[PDB]
């Protein structure tokens, strides 16, 4: 722990938890949001026999644990799970006590207000954090980009959000949430791999196939033409070496998996591709600034490490929108940490401690005070 009473910066992103100290450039403890529990009961002795398993421990113990998600698309299952994982993060991973450091947290866009009131109340009772602040990840990604104008595409693991912000002001009237995310990607890839001869249901193979998505997946420039040329495609077809050692070969599926977000009719969504959701979002607001939105679009999330989103994005928007002004996307490398960086940025300036949510305000007005203290 630093000698100074600097604040805690924790991004509880929908899919990854990244925690550390204020003034740091990158979060120190970063782990996926999976939680493992003992698949069977206790009869043995001498070691183990522990209920909750979180972090890399559960990653190593994936096979003998039922792998469960305490949060999915924002919905909260069991607050005890968050209690334990935050205990682990603060003491076993961050080696910090929350008594002496206020916490800045980031929440998924348009999270329930009742969810905020319950989570804040359990937090304040269970923990002894001196002060509090929670913010939407959209403005955090904006801060990471450091440009007040643009539309943020936050692609988490449970929801994809499109949020327009012009000159550093939120536009909730033109903000939308789409239920397509990593979960859907894994599902669709699971069914295609089932049609390829490999049919698995458990979560270990879920992580294997999301790793495959991280490594080999394409974003098709032209879809049906690329499957037509991918009929044989000995060179274009790509293989992976699974940890057991078998060589699993995939061809068109590499670019037929992310395409589903762009083409939701593959597995039955009324909503069109996410580019249509950015398009409608843009026109909902006044006409004039729309060009700037076209030229200032930002994309954020862990998924963004994949190739192909930028070219597809620009080409389709230019197809939909007039091609007079030039559209260009901006995306700094390793932007999944960017939100946490913005949290540090929030703690950088000396005005931030004017609106810390202190203990006594919550003791006076209950959780309801946040309704007036954040917004």
């Amino acid at each position: 722990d630093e000698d100074e009473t600097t604040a805690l910066v924790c991004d509880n992103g929908s899919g990854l938890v990244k925690a550390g100290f204020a003034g740091d450039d990158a979060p120190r403890a970063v782990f996926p949001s999976i939680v493992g529990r003992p698949r069977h009961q206790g009869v043995m002795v001498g070691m183990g026999q522990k209920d909750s398993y979180v972090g890399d421990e559960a990653q190593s113990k994936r096979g003998i644990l039922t792998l469960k998600y305490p949060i999915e698309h924002g919905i909260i299952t069991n607050w005890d799970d968050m209690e334990k994982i935050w205990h682990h993060t603060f003491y076993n991973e961050l080696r910090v006590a929350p008594e002496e450091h206020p916490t800045l947290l980031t929440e998924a866009p348009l999270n329930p207000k009742a969810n905020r009131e319950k989570m804040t109340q359990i937090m304040f009772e269970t923990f002894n954090v001196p002060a509090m602040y929670v913010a939407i990840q959209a403005v955090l990604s904006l801060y990471a980009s450091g440009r007040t104008t643009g539309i943020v595409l936050d692609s988490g693991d449970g929801v994809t959000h499109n949020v327009p912000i012009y000159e550093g002001y939120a536009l909730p009237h033109a903000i939308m949430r789409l239920d397509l995310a990593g979960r859907d990607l894994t599902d669709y890839l699971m069914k295609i791999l089932t049609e390829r001869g490999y049919s698995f249901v458990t979560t270990a193979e879920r992580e294997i196939v999301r790793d495959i998505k991280e490594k080999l997946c394409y974003v098709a420039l032209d879809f049906e033409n690329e499957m037509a040329t991918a009929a044989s495609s000995s060179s274009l077809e790509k293989s992976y070496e699974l940890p057991d050692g078998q060589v699993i070969t995939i061809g068109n599926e590499r670019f037929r998996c992310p395409e589903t977000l762009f083409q939701p009719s593959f597995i039955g969504m009324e909503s069109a591709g996410i580019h249509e959701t950015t398009y409608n979002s843009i026109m909902k607001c006044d006409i004039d600034i729309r060009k700037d939105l076209y030229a200032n679009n930002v994309m954020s999330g862990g998924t963004t490490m994949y190739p192909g989103i930028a070219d597809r994005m620009q080409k389709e928007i230019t197809a939909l929108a007039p091609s007079t002004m030039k559209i260009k996307i901006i995306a700094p490398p390793e932007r999944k940490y960017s939100v946490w960086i913005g949290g540090s940025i929030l703690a950088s300036l000396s005005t931030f401690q004017q609106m810390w949510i202190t203990k006594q305000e919550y003791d006076e007005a209950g959780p309801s005070i946040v309704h007036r203290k954040c917004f």
């Binding site: 450039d25 450091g146 960086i341 940025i345």
Partner: protein, 52 residues
Amino acid sequence: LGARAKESLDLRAHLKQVKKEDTEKENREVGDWRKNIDALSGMEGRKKKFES
């Protein structure tokens, strides 16, 4: 008649000349100056601040 015409046109020319005097005083110092954006290529990439 010539006297009437001279008087009218002289008054008109007097108002015209008083109007010219203002333009004679200044003609360019009313416009703003140039500050177009250009060059800056030599600036570095890792900004001393994190808005990089």
